[model samples]
Target: MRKKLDLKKFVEDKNQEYAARALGLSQKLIEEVLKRGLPVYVETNKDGNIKVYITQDGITQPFPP
Candidate 1:
């Protein structure tokens, strides 16, 4: 996990596009995260499921989304 790892140490898992389809995402959205290097946060829910969320560029909204 060199180079891009630090760039995306930043996911629920690997951030690799291979399994990204299993999680329901678009190629464009994936490109956005990979290209712009958006902030990524992964948290385990009360149901014990891991979910990943990313910030939209130039967002000023508070949490509790």
Candidate 2:
């Protein structure tokens, strides 16, 4: 299957309007993702500090390590 689009990263790198247009999604969907919070993947470094990365499939952990 094709990978899903990452609205959060799109919004972060560009803007909500751009993301919506690129994903062919409505502005409402973009707003919804923002409303809930950006979807991200978190990783801990050697210092125990958390670093975050945006995911195309929202916040999920089963993809890979």
Candidate 3:
């Protein structure tokens, strides 16, 4: 079966628009991930770290580029 991917990854998906805007990179962040052919979300860590989450079917996992 073919996979279902949405273009509005920023507004939808994991809802990273808020986080993206917080870092002053609302579009580039989403755009870069989109270019990699996957939906992504920003993950914040307690140790002052930021992680990028890449998903294909909306699950937190590694996606092939």
Candidate 4:
């Protein structure tokens, strides 16, 4: 009587409600960047927007394609 289907749903909902604390990259995203082995940078503006940049071959562009 292990309610396996309910357990799966519960786990998915837990991730849905999960939030990351401010001031850093989420490990999952970082893991991806590390796998690609690229130089990266992050910063915030006074307008409350965070900017992420990745530089490759001397050309820099925004993250997330």
- Each candidate: what lDDT? 0.45, 0.50, 0.48, 0.42
TM-score of each: 0.43, 0.41, 0.29, 0.38
In model 4, residue pairs whose N, Cα or C atoms come closer than 3 Å (at least 3 residues apart or on different chains), thus clashing, are none
Off by over 4 Å in 4: 1-30, 46-48
Pairs with steric clashes in candidate 1: none
Per-residue error for 42 in candidate 2, Å, reads 20
RMSD (CA, Å), candidate 3 to true, equals 8.3
Question: Candidate 2 on 1-65: residue-level lDDT in tens?
Answer: 22334546657877877655444345775576566665644443455443334445644432222
Residues 1-65, model 1: lDDT tens digits:
01123224434365656424332356566566667776544444565443445556555221232
Error of 4 at 23 (Å): 9.5
Q: Candidate 3, after superposition: displacement of residue 11 in Å?
A: 15
Tens-digit per-residue lDDT, 3-64, candidate 3: 33443544464565654543234466466565565655455456544455556555654222
Q: lDDT of model 4 at residue 19?
A: 15
| Leading candidate by lDDT | 2
Which candidate order results from sorting by lDDT in descending order?
Answer: 2, 3, 1, 4
Comparison by lDDT, 1 against 4, better one: 1
Query: How well is each residue in 1-65 modelled by candidate 4, as lDDT tens digits?
Result: 11112212322454422311211346565444445555555455566544446466686544442
